[PDB]
Amino acid sequence: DCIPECPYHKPLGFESGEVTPDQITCSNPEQYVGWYSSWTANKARLNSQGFGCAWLSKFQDSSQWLQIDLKEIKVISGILTQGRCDIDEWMTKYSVQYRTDERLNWIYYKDQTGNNRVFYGNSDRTSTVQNLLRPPIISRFIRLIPLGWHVRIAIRMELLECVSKCA
Amino acid sequence: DCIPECPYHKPLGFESGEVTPDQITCSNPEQYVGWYSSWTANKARLNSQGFGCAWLSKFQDSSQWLQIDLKEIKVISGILTQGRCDIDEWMTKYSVQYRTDERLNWIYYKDQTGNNRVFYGNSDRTSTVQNLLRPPIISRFIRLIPLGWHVRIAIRMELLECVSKCA
Amino acid sequence: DCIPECPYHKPLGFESGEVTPDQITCSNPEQYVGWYSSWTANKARLNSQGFGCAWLSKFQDSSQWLQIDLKEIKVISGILTQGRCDIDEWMTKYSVQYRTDERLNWIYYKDQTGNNRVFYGNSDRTSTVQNLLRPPIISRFIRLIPLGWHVRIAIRMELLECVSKCA
Amino acid sequence: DCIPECPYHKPLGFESGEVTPDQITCSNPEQYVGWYSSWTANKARLNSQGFGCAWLSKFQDSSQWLQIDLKEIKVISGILTQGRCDIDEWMTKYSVQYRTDERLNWIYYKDQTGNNRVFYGNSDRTSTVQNLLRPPIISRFIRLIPLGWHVRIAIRMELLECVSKCA
Amino acid sequence: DCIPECPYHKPLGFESGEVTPDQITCSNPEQYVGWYSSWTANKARLNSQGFGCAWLSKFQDSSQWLQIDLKEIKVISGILTQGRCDIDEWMTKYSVQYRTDERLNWIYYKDQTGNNRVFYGNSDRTSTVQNLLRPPIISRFIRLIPLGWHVRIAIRMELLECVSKCA
Amino acid sequence: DCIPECPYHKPLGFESGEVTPDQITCSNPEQYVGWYSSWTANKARLNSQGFGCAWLSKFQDSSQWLQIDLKEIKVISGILTQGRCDIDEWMTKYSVQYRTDERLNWIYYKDQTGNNRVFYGNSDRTSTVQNLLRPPIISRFIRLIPLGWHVRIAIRMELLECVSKCA
Amino acid sequence: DCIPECPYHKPLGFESGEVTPDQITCSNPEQYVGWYSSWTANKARLNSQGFGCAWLSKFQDSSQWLQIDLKEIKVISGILTQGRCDIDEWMTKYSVQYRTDERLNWIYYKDQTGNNRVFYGNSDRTSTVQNLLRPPIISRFIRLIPLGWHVRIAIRMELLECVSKCA
Amino acid sequence: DCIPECPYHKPLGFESGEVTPDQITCSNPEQYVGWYSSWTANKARLNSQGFGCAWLSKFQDSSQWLQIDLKEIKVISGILTQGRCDIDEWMTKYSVQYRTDERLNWIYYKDQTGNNRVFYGNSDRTSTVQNLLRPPIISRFIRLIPLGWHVRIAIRMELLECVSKCA
């Protein structure tokens, strides 16, 4: 008929681990300037912990990000972000970018007249902030840029989609 | 069409004893550290009594739990917990975990922004607390962890589902 | 479609005498400890009188009851109780139990969080108390236990069901 | 679909005389103890007069009645009662009984919790009291017992049913 | 579907003269005791005048009437009455009787509990009083009895029915 | 389905001149007593002017009229009347009569209890008064009688009908 | 189904120039008494300017007009009028006439009881006045007569229709 | 069925770069009077920057514009305008023109009685102003004329359409 709201969100699976580690791409491909390559992508997942929480970033001047390569255009309804657990990290902002097809260039998340919006980070560590995105995000390659940093950035995340599903 | 609310709950059968004793799995597989192996799983069922109420746990530091192995992904609408009858036990909290397929790892019950919730235990023994779970729980293997303890934990339980059924 | 409320109740037939006397089972199978075997089951029926009202019970410490063996799982919408006519008997309480299939064990009537309810008896003799049961009772073998006693228990009863029927 | 209310009542025909005289049965089969056998059944019909109104009853201690033998289970929606015209007769009460099939025994009219009701008679003679019966009466053999008497009982009556009919 | 209200009334035709004169039957078959046989039935029709208005009646002690023989069971929705034009005649009352089939006996118009009603006549001559009858009158032979008289009775009339008709 | 109200009126055509002059019949067939035979029927049409407005009438004591012979039973929803233009003429009243089939006799316009109504004429000349007739007039031969006169009567008119039409 | 309101208006095309110049007919066929034949019909179109705005009229005593010959009966929903641009011209009134078929005679725009209406002209030059016509105008040949003049009349116009169209 | 509002807007793609550079036509075909031919059309796109923002215009007296040649009649629901980034530029107004078919002449955007509207420019540079156009613009060749200038005009833009799309 037409997309609804929704009524319920479908987590993709970062806690369940439906997503493969190969689809969590970290900025700094050298991984020695904006990462230590430890903590791994598997730690950078919602409620994943016990040996490191999040991904790390050695240098970061809001030109570091975390990408989710879905390799299929999917409809994303929200972005869950959770703090680390090593030491405290204060609220940041997010720039939501997405690209479909893995072609052309990237475009920005829009929300009303003004046509953009940044979402709040994690105020105090080891807690999840639920940033639901009202319009449906048609994305194949997602880029979540954390803007601002308390020392460095280190988030854990899971995406919410929507499957009707109905029973 | 789509899952409703519901309008009526369907007990699985712990009082009726539809569930086999083989599907009530207790933590501590040694059963001599977090159990005495007496009281049995049949006693640990809603309104089952006359020779022991609940399951016992010798040691427990909120790392003991009771699991319901359904061996079929079912839709759970509530968790009934009832106190023991030997001696008093005060309110505890619950962590609701579930896993489908008997694969991957376990995930947590979510309820709104903040994405978690713990449910209240039994305030005074030999009484049932009705903890209905608003969203439908898609689970094959259920883990109910009791958090906190008045000496030890010992609950009796039955699950509520939903069958339409209609007449 | 789905069960309604109802809009009208269908008496099974205890006054009409649709029920056979063979389906009214009295506690105390010895019938010389919790009965005199006079008054008979036919007297223990709604508005049946003229030679004894109700069934009698010599001893009773709330472990005497009256069962209706339907021998078919039926949907019961209410329990009518009427006092005796020999001498006065004051209000009692009822425990409503039912079992389907004539298998497993018995289960209790539930009504909201707390999951049980007892119904009021007959305040003053020779008068009918209409205890309607809001959810539909799926029962094959009904056990109505009278709790409390003014000397002894002695009730007359008829069940209400629901047939749509429509014209 | 289902019985309605109604919207209009259908008189059976006592004024029209659709009913045969053979279907108006009077109590006292001797007809010399609770009747004089004059006034006849044809006089005991709504608005029938000119040579005697109603049926008479010599003795009556509320164990005299008038029955309508329909010889077909019909749906009765009301009972019209009209006073006599010989001499005044004051309000009485009615007990409404009915039996279907011409088998088993008789059952009582029910109206709410308490499960019975008596209807008002004719306050002052030669006037009709419209006692509509809210639930549909499934009856084959109707017994209207007049309770109380100003000297004796003597009513004229017609039944109301319901045919949709629609045009 | 079912008879409506209506929304519009259909005059039978007394003004149009659809009705034959042979269907307007006057009381007093001698026509020399309760009529002069002049004024004729054609004058006794709504808005018929110029040589006598109405039908006359020499003697009348409310046992004179005017009948409409439809010779087909029709659904009558109202009775129009109009005064004469010779000399004044004051308000009377009407008893509405009808009979179907031209068999059995006659029955009375009913309106609510009390089961009867009389309608108002013409207050001052040469004016029409619209007496609509709320329930549909199933009649083949209509008898309109005028009760009371200012010297004598003399009305002009037309019946209203209902044809949907719809366009 | 059924006639509506309407929502829009359809002029027959007196201004357009759809009506033939042969269908506008004037009273006084001698045309030398209640007419001068000049002004012609073509002048007696809504907004027809330039050489005489309306039809004239030499003598008239409210027994002169203008008829529209439709020669087909049509549904008339209103009567437009417009004043003349030679000299002033004050408000009159109208009696609306109609006859179908060109058989039987004529009948009167009815509007509520009282069953008649007269419509207002033209207060001041050369202006149109819109007299809409709420119920649908089933007419083949229309007679509009002007009652009262300021010297004489002289109206111009057009009829309104209703065609759904819908687009 | 039936004509709507509308929801959107469809300009015919005078600005777009869908209308051919051959369909804009000016009064004064001599074109030397009520026109100079310069300004041309192409200038007399909504927002047409740059070398003369409107059509001119040398003499005009409200017996000059502009006609739109559609040569197809179309449904007109509004009349747009725009002022000239040479020198100021003050508000005028309009008489809206139309004729279908190019047969019979012309008829007037009606709006409620009183059956006519004139529309406002352009208060100050070079500005458009939107005169929407509530009922649908069934016209083949449109005549817009400007009544009153500030020196002379000179309007620019475009018609609004309605096409559903829907997407 | 019919065009909706919408519920969501579909950007054509100037940020995504769906539009080819060949469809962004700039006024001044000499490109040395009202342009420097640097900044290019690719810079004159919503959120395109890093080496020049917008298109430039050397001379401009509100007779310079930017056109979008769609080469297909499309339904445009809004015009996004964004400021430059070199130096500040203050709010301007817009004239929205469009032409379909690439034939006839151009027509103006209308909004209510008065039939035109200009939209607000960018108050302060490097910010987007969302000018949604309430009626659907049927256009093949779009001309956005900026009226007024703070030194010169230089806007970046993207169009919004509407695809239902529905999921």
From Swiss-Prot, chains A, B, C, D, E, F, G, H:
- Cellular compartments annotated: Secreted; Cell membrane
F5/8 type C domain location is 6-162
Specify whether Signal is a keyword of the entry: yes
Source species, domain of life: Eukaryota
Could you state one GO biological process linked to this protein?
protein homooligomerization
Q: Name one GO molecular function term.
A: phosphatidylinositol-3,4-bisphosphate binding
Q: Can you list the GO cellular component terms from the UniProt entry?
A: external side of plasma membrane; extracellular space; neuron to neuron synapse; photoreceptor inner segment; protein-containing complex
Please describe the organ and tissue distribution of this protein's expression.
Restricted to the retina (at protein level). Detected in the inner segment of the photoreceptors, the inner nuclear layer, the inner plexiform layer and the ganglion cell layer (at protein level). At the macula, expressed in both the outer and inner nuclear layers and in the inner plexiform layer (at protein level). Detected in retina. Detected only within the photoreceptor cell layer, most prominently within the inner segments of the photoreceptors. Undetectable in the inner plexiform layers and the inner nuclear layer.
UniProt entry tagged with the keyword Hydrolase: no
Keyword terms of this UniProt record? Cell adhesion, Cell membrane, Disease variant, Disulfide bond, Lipid-binding, Membrane, Secreted, Sensory transduction, Signal, Vision
Q: How is it placed in the membrane, per its record?
A: Peripheral membrane protein
Which cysteine pairs are covalently linked by disulfides here?
6-162, 53-85
Q: Which disease is it linked to?
A: Retinoschisis juvenile X-linked 1: A vitreo-retinal dystrophy characterized by macular pathology and by splitting of the superficial layer of the retina. Macular changes are present in almost all cases. In the fundi, radially oriented intraretinal foveomacular cysts are seen in a spoke-wheel configuration, with the absence of foveal reflex in most cases. In addition, approximately half of cases have bilateral peripheral retinoschisis in the inferotemporal part of the retina.
According to the record's subunit comment, the protein's assembly and interactions are: Homooctamer of 4 homodimers; disulfide-linked. The homooctamer has a flat, cogwheel structure with a diameter of about 14 nm. Two stacked octamers can assemble to form a hexadecamer.
What role is this protein assigned?
Binds negatively charged membrane lipids, such as phosphatidylserine and phosphoinositides. May play a role in cell-cell adhesion processes in the retina, via homomeric interaction between octamers present on the surface of two neighboring cells. Required for normal structure and function of the retina.
- The protein here is known as Retinoschisin
Organism equals: Homo sapiens (Human)
Lineage of producing organism: Eukaryota, Metazoa, Chordata, Craniata, Vertebrata
Q: From the entire protein, which fragment is shown?
A: 58 to 224 of 224
